[PDB]
Amino acid sequence: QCVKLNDGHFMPVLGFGTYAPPEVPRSKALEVTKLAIEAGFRHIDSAHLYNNEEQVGLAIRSKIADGSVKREDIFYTSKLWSTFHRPELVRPALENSLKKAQLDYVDLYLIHSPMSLKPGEELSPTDENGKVIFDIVDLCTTWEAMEKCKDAGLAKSIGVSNFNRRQLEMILNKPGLKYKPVCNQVECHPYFNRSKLLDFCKSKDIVLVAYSALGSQRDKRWVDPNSPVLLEDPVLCALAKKHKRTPALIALRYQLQRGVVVLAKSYNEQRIRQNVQVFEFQLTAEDMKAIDGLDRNLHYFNSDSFASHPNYPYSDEY
Ligand SMILES: NC(=O)c1ccc[n+]([C@@H]2O[C@H](COP(=O)([O-])OP(=O)(O)OC[C@H]3O[C@@H](n4cnc5c(N)ncnc54)[C@H](OP(=O)(O)O)[C@@H]3O)[C@@H](O)[C@H]2O)c1
Ligand SMILES: C[C@]12CC/C(=N/O)C=C1CC[C@@H]1[C@@H]2CC[C@@]2(C)[C@H]1CC[C@@]2(O)Cc1ccccn1
Numbered sequence: 144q145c146v147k148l149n150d151g152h153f154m155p156v157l158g159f160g161t162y163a164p165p166e167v168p169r170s171k172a173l174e175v176t177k178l179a180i181e182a183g184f185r186h187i188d189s190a191h192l193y194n195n196e197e198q199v200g201l202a203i204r205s206k207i208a209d210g211s212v213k214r215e216d217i218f219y220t221s222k223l224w225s226t227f228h229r230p231e232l233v234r235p236a237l238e239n240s241l242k243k244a245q246l247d248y249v250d251l252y253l254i255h256s257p258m259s260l261k262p263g264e265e266l267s268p269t270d271e272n273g274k275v276i277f278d279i280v281d282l283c284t285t286w287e288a289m290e291k292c293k294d295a296g297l298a299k300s301i302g303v304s305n306f307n308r309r310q311l312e313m314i315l316n317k318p319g320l321k322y323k324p325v326c327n328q329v330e331c332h333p334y335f336n337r338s339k340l341l342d343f344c345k346s347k348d349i350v351l352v353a354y355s356a357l358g359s360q361r362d363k364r365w366v367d368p369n370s371p372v373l374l375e376d377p378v379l380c381a382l383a384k385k386h387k388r389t390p391a392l393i394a395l396r397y398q399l400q401r402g403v404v405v406l407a408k409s410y411n412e413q414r415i416r417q418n419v420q421v422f423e424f425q426l427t428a429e430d431m432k433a434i435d436g437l438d439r440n441l442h443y444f445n446s447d448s449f450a451s452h453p454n455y456p457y458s459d460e461y
């Protein structure tokens with residue numbers, strides 16, 4: 144179950160989310176990425192920022208060498224981190240990810256975020272008060288360096304993440320554009336369903352890829368503990384009982400039926416195997432309408448640090 148991207152490549156519509164907080168041992172990413180592949184995940188979502196490409200790569204190499212899958216059956220995503228937006232930094236950043244993952248190419252390379260940061264050793268470069276230092280980079284120059292990565296065969300497809308409509312339009316209207324972004328990977332779940340941005344992406348043949356589709360890991364440093372807990376939503380819970388599924392499976396199936404490509408992070412063997420059950424059942428039109436009604440424009444991730452960035456994607460909300 145794949146979608147045709149606007150460059151003619153194919154993306155599986157269910158993806159495995161590999162981010163775990165830093166407190167989780169790096170060994171787990173190797174263990175659960177192999178379990179995800181065993182359960183039937185073929186789209187694997189990673190990034191420089193996640194500090195796991197060595198382990199995710201090794202799980203992929205392992206399941207190819209064990210005869211479970213071939214390289215072409217796996218759809219591997221990496222992401223260019225915000226310290227590597229300056230165009231001369233882009234290709235060495237991809238080559239560094241390919242070296243860590245020990246893959247020859249990624250299926251998909253994203254601009255992780257439009258919010259450029261100062262280059263350096265540090266992935267979060269901070270001043271004396273822990274205030275992050277921003278960089279002013281025309282992301283069209285970043286996009287041209289991504290396009291060269293595709294021409295070099297190092298990335299099959301290129302796309303973006305955390306972009307709003309205005310920032311997508313900046314790439315779509317770039318003079319001499321060669322490659323449209325195949326996708327925009329954004330926060331998307333029933334409390335933030337991104338219906339308008341979804342329609343916009345559909346009209347431009349850009350796939351919306353949902354992250355935090357199960358309501359995020361609710362890490363204290365990023366997510367207000369007072370925020371409503373998606374998987375305890377009474378409507379999701381009532382729909383789970385109706386279908387004899389789980390709230391997680393309702394939330395994933397919602398995304399599939401609205402033409403969204405959905406990620407699902409789990410480090411738990413039972414839940415990893417449960418999540419592939421999304422292909423096994425259907426929501427009614429009335430079920431879809433009830434989930435649509437849960438929308439509240441709630442982004443789980445907040446940063447007053449990034450709120451002030453010129454490229455803050457939520458920047459003109461109020
Ligand atoms: N582009 C970006 O800026 C960005 C940002 C954030 C994330 N991402 C990507 O998107 C992925 C997923 O988003 P996320 O990390 O926020 O997590 P998520 O997919 O919203 O999942 C949140 C939590 O749901 C639990 N869960 C999973 N399956 C379940 C099931 N069947 N029943 C009950 N609970 C279940 C997991 O806990 P257990 O592990 O205990 O099962 C997980 O911690 C990330 O891993 C990452 O790859 C991208
Ligand atoms: C650390 C983090 C939260 C936990 C997690 N769970 O899977 C995964 C990640 C990795 C990506 C991070 C994210 C936090 C927010 C980051 C840093 C983002 C990238 C770019 C972004 O600035 C996007 C943004 C969004 C909302 C408000 C302000 N900024």
Ligand code: NA
Nearest residue numbers: 162190222255
């Ligand atoms: Na991410």
Ligand code: NA
Nearest residue numbers: 308309312313
């Ligand atoms: Na515009």
Ligand code: NA
Nearest residue numbers: 366367370443
């Ligand atoms: Na929050």
Ligand code: NA
Nearest residue numbers: 442457458460
């Ligand atoms: Na906002």
Ligand code: NA
Nearest residue numbers: 458459460461
């Ligand atoms: Na404002």
